[model samples]
Target: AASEDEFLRYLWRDYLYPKQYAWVLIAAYVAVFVVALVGNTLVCLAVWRNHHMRTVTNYFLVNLSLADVLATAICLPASLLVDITESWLFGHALCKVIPYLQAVSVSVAVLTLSFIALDRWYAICHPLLFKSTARRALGSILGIWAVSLAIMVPQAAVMECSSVLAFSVCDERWADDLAPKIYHSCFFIVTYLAPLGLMAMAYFQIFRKLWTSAEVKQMRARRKTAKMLMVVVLVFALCYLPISVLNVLKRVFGMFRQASDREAVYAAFTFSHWLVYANSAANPIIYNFLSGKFREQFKAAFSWW
Candidate 1:
């Protein structure tokens, strides 16, 4: 009498019991948070302690670090808890507010990175105009958050708090229901699609300008920005695209098949979910490893700690 979906759920609960995965997941999550927290903290300190590092570019760098520190501290740990515990115990109020805040934070973080790319583009390609006060850069950062908040407001407003099908699990409302469909569509557009489009445009133009520029030094600088932009794009794609595609496949297959096929869909969902969590911890390493300056500064700053 049990459905295939139920059987798969049982398999998940009994055979593949995700607790072991949870331990490994939480360990990796905590390790990444520690490294990023310390590295970004050192960057913050280095910028503060050394006056020469205080420039318009470094101001944006500090903003980037501040954003990463917040992401690692807030988003990463909470996500790890959810993965390990298999529930959200933060209650209805936090369920509504935290997701919205996380959405806003993530949007702001990505937009900040885009701004950094744009600032570098201007500095290299339009040197005269890029020479501005740090206040101007700070104003720009504030504007990025404002825009990101506006994008995230609707999702926050609509976030439903509920127990999963089983009372033992609490989660942000997700199901085949209409409200959840709205949530998915909104999430798909606001978080993945919009940010991805904007970054592509900004980075493309920046790369074009860099390609035409004559200075070897400026060319090198632009190349660094290009590499960072690539890493950002790659992480976003890896984190979001697989899950999105899997959702699409599941829906399309469901239209033609019996309910028996649900188990395979469930398996795919489990795979994609891990990937989405993996994104949060992946970026700090990719960025640092790709850039010698970032790596050097990260190491030197941590040396004293």
Candidate 2:
């Protein structure tokens, strides 16, 4: 890899160009932040204010929204700053901590989505059991956070403060070396592969249950739930899977290549990074556009009590 000077100049010229664009980028992110913030805030407020929404499912949604807000406020803004500067001027200390937090946030988001799917599966398939103790949703939410934090430990401890190939930015070193490779492999399997597998299975069962269930209303509700859960999984996967897979491929490639090859890799990596950051904003739009309850609640909360 080139030394810091060459890297920094590359960053400034290519990534941080036309300084005025920085404000435009900031404005875009700020708009996204405010929209997501307001949407999630209304969802939380409605859940808190109306006892009718105090179900286990809604509680899980609150927790999910909580994670989204944190991801938006804590992670997305930091990412935007880095993107605008095209360097990690935030210092080595933050460089170390932020990736860990971002990983944790991502893990929590995926886990929560999976758990929501499971909740729906159980609710539809095992109604008596689900009815008796759906309150355990809170415990499930806590478990999600605990597990995500545990999953993120290695990235936090082992993958931080590493230099990039094309830019001066120091970032999480997921596969820089043998140890980091192992850590990242574990993270990939546990956080993305395993959770996605479980979510898919849960949705499959949910669909089967809907297909056979005698109650038309219940079946319709379960179908809606399945559709919503799948949308969540699809959106999250769209955001991160490309970059994640490319990260694995980069590890496999193991050497710098021709200029064209390097540019392609960089472009893929850059797009993936932006998509992942975009996840922080996308959820609110999904909720607003797709969920009637969410839309009504958001408008109601914003306009009235």
Candidate 3:
């Protein structure tokens, strides 16, 4: 234990780069945080002010943006500080609550995207049988949050501020030795893999329908919307897939046999984690660029400025 503490102390001291490099890191964090906060806020506001943008699909999008906004507001600042300082300064309560909220927010975002894909699939693939009402959409959004909260409850239980080589580190402190592995595996499968699979399947069916249907103007419009969403899903996968893969690998590797190897894993994990958070900032930009309606609404919403 004494030797482990000494090793941890050494790693902590050297984990962050020099002071000059620190500013770059700070700038990067601020850029992502500001973009995510402002972009998602605009998305929500645009949906609220524009009646034409308040369709069932847009309702899901609004909820997704709200989840991203929560993540940026609640998680990013503390996480950035911790990454730079390499210490948990926020005390015990926040240590538990912040991660829990982050987990819930991320789960809600992913689940909302999945639901959006499902909603689109039903709308286009079974137009006659499937109709999405505002009430139903709102109910779905509530259900997503409820499920996300339930899924993330374990995060609050397991997370805590633990003393590591005289510095406080916030991390999971599962009682059972195998608990973290089991929890992470389940989280990865549920929040990432399954949702992504569902999105792909939905998009596949949508694409097939587009290909088979006649070239009517209405069909063309639905095709464009489907393409836009597919792009969004693709971007989401690109941003998040690396983190999900690395997380599983890191756990599989556990503590590496060599200290250098462990440090390498840590470095990769940090980079991948940043990419995951950056996805929140990227979504609204994708919407504005890809969806004509979103672009027009966004322009109108900020036109006063």
Pick by lDDT: which candidate is best? 3
**Best TM-score among the predictions, by candidate number:** 3
- The lDDT of model 3 is 0.83
Model 3 per-residue lDDT tens digits across residues 163-228:
876679897776775777887888889988988998999899999998745549878888777888
TM-score computed on alpha carbons, candidate 1? 0.71
Using Cα atoms with residue i matched to residue i, what is each candidate's TM-score against the true structure? 0.71, 0.79, 0.88
Give the Å shift of residue 235 in candidate 3: 1.2
As for TM-score, the candidate ahead, 2 or 3, is 3
Task: Determine which window of 10 residues in candidate 2 has minimal summed lDDT.
Answer: 249-258
lDDT of 2 by residue, 1-305 (tens): 66998988988887776465556667767777787777778778878877866867678778878888877777777777666565776667877677878888787888788777777776776666654244677888889899888867777665455466644576555444676566656767877888888888877777777764567766776576567667877888777798778766655445434566754565466557667767766776676776677677777876775
Cα lDDT listed for each candidate: 0.65, 0.72, 0.83
lDDT of 1 at 46: 60
Error of 1 at 203 (Å): 2.9
Candidate 1 regions off by >4 Å?
Answer: 1-20, 50-52, 55-58, 121-133, 163-183, 211-214, 243-280
